[PDB]
Design a protein around this ligand. Sequence first.
Ligand SMILES: O=C(Nc1cncc2ccc(F)cc12)[C@@H]1CCOc2cc(F)c(Cl)cc21
Ligand SMILES: O=C(Nc1cncc2ccc(F)cc12)[C@@H]1CCOc2cc(F)c(Cl)cc21
Ligand SMILES: [Cl-]
Lengths: 298, 302
Amino acid sequence: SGFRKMAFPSGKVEGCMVQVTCGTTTLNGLWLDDVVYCPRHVICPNYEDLLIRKSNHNFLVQAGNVQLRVIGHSMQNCVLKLKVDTANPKTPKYKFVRIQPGQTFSVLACYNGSPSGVYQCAMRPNFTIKGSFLNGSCGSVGFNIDYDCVSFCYMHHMELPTGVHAGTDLEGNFYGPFVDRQTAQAAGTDTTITVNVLAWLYAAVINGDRWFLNRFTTTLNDFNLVAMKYNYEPLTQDHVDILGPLSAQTGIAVLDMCASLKELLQNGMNGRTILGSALLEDEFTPFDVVRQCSGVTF
Amino acid sequence: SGFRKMAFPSGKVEGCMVQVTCGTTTLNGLWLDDVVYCPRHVICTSEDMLNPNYEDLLIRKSNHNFLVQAGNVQLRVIGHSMQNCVLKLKVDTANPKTPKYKFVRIQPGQTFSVLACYNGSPSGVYQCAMRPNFTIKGSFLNGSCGSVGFNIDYDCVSFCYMHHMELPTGVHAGTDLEGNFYGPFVDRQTAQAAGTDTTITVNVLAWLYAAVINGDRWFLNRFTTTLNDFNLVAMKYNYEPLTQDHVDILGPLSAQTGIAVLDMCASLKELLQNGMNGRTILGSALLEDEFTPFDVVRQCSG
Ligand SMILES: O=C(Nc1cncc2ccc(F)cc12)[C@@H]1CCOc2cc(F)c(Cl)cc21
Ligand SMILES: O=C(Nc1cncc2ccc(F)cc12)[C@@H]1CCOc2cc(F)c(Cl)cc21
Ligand SMILES: [Cl-]
């Protein structure tokens, strides 16, 4: 029993964190095989022109108390790839994956190439992440683990004025309409990840919380009309299919749970809580719920 | 900016998780140097659990009865001893991944990271707090016994908890790494219930200071309170008494934000009285009590 916001074990990623120093800027880099990946803003804009002025010895890479030697450098979108002479002996089995809004991942927050904390979060529908980052956290990475494979999905680049965070996949493509430059940028109006709220309602049922259940069911169209009103993301047939296992396990059809969600949106919780929360939690995917309520290991 | 429930990076602890089997029971063990630590109830059957005599059950066991598996490598047990409710299995190989570590016993209200494991394999990491009733509100399934709670301040792992059991209310009970239970619990299937839980007041105040540091001031008021009047009020909401030690501990946060500890106590009194009125504090509609004053300073400053 119990339901916690749980991150993946960060060990496979910790063995990849290095410090990258260029001029006065110091941030984090991800050392996989003989390449160190980091935000291209470490050289700070015309990034091609700024980069052409740099030599390999301008980039100081530090892996623990060992200085790595940079033997090449290239840019791929908003990520700088520093070729080093030494392949990381701790390189795990990995992939670079681009995630969709609503998908969750673990963030290993780092400062000076040293991991300080791990937390779970979701890529918001507005492509920002509600992270916890201070100055020096750029280059920190987001990831998932699938069996023994680390899927790198995020690299931290910046903080928006509202305190939310923006970054790229490991190929340097930003999530959202953001750019890596000092200019006026604002996150769009955010919405609630509906499939994730439903998955969390199933987790609550699995944990013995049933007060919000009702005898009612709804149509996918009627629920989406209600979801559009309360700034909730539309629920697709794919989402309904994805919630199938949880629906079969609890005996509560997705549209049966949707009618619970609809009543919760129009009436509130009425002093009650669900899994110790007075708000509807949307940062657990259906897969996160099954993984935690079944104990999958890595 | 931002405030998250943040766990310590679990890597130093992952390299210590092993699987311990004794008969039909399989749980997790913590491999540090040449010793594997695990709950002593690994020697029991589900039948023995009502009134086990661990000394009697342990004397009947030999080293080869304990199967220890570190990854795909079977470790050889060369000795065994019991220390309170923990079984210490001496093995023939020192863990090459042994970090710098300490065994620390924590007090209620203290937080720590939990590396949940099944079959000696880590499955997740989350942040926890020792509740005032000495239970932890964890997320644990069958086979999670032996999973550990820890803090990683500096490069040293302070082991503070080993999971032993789930109470009927779904909350969890365990021991420090010396095998001493937190709370009035015993490693027996007898009727045991957690005492009425209360809110960790000093932690809620620390979290209100984290909100101020992050630009949330809506809950502040022009009032102050005596420490005694605050405690008379807070007790009525099932909040732990706030001691002079707690007031002193909140000093740095008070100095940083310019809000006296007793002024923040008056905002808390008002929040208890009024609720949030549709508002949130740091993305939460409830008063969060699983961030210590030390956690707030670490996350907001470094
Ligand atoms: O975003 C940045 N810094 C920080 C990131 N995450 C949390 C931070 C929290 C506080 C803080 F002061 C800096 C934090 C840097 C430095 C400020 O300006 C820019 C502008 C940019 F276009 C880019 Cl791509 C990066 C930055
Ligand atoms: O607590 C136990 N198991 C589990 C622990 N943590 C979450 C669990 C969640 C579910 C579950 F079925 C077992 C879980 C075991 C087996 C049941 O009985 C006892 C009795 C005891 F005296 C002791 Cl010390 C341990 C246990
Ligand atoms: Cl303590």
